[PDB]
Amino acid sequence: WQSFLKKELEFLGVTQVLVGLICLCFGTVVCSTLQTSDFDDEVLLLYRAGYPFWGAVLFVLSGFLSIMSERKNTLYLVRGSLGANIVSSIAAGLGIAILILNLSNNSAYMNYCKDITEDDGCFVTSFITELVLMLLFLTILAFCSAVLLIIYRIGQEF
Amino acid sequence: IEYRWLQLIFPSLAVILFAVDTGLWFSTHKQFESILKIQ
Amino acid sequence: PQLCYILDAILFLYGIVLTLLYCRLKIQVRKADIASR
Amino acid sequence: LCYILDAILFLYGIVLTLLYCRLKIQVRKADIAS
């Protein structure tokens, strides 16, 4: 399974670059379009903790270093891409915890919502719930990819 | 409400990625055009 | 309503799957064409 | 509009799925013959 993971190692970094750039896009549309003082910090815990920005930077960095360490096979890119994947797995686990916490906060908010279009806060909470759900899916992909990169570059060193 | 366009964020981010895919089609077709021309 | 948003979200997930598969195929064809060259 | 904008965009996604399934069989056909 060493070659069976090395053949898809570059894709397994490209998915981190993709998840990071979608994290940047979601963070910049939440930062620009939303007036975040009109909504609760429990509902916007994804943006209040800043996870799209510091998760986007770390996912793009670790995926880019994974792409470069596949494409160059340099002994300095490896152990730099491995450390980038350690901190990307830490960022993805913290993001998974933050997104589950924000899902719980959004469920507690939408308990007090008769419909998705009850007011502006219910709709923005449901939109954030949808965006938390498809950042939880992408963070699960990025976490599984980063853990697989960790397994490959640790079993390589065994 | 005046926040409906946030749910226009999702398909627009789709029509970016699908657009990326047709680039990722063409850039995969031409490098598969240049790999069957050599045989 | 909720149905159009659910269908929109599953279409975005479909877009994620297709761009992951096109990225996989792109690096595969790039590897096969940088191996021959 | 979201229903027409997603009905045309599912079609634009089925088209890309068809071209992926058309490219993948050609890649594996070239991979069979080295």
Ligand SMILES: CC(C)CCC[C@@H](C)[C@H]1CC[C@H]2[C@@H]3CC=C4C[C@@H](OC(=O)CCC(=O)O)CC[C@]4(C)[C@H]3CC[C@]12C
């Ligand atoms: C707002 C979000 C939805 C947009 C961000 C998605 C795309 C702009 C990026 C994310 C990661 C990128 C991928 C990162 C790495 C690669 C490897 C790259 O390799 C090459 O450069 C080939 C070189 C050559 O053809 O000579 C080909 C493009 C690709 C698949 C990229 C395709 C475009 C992707 C999907």
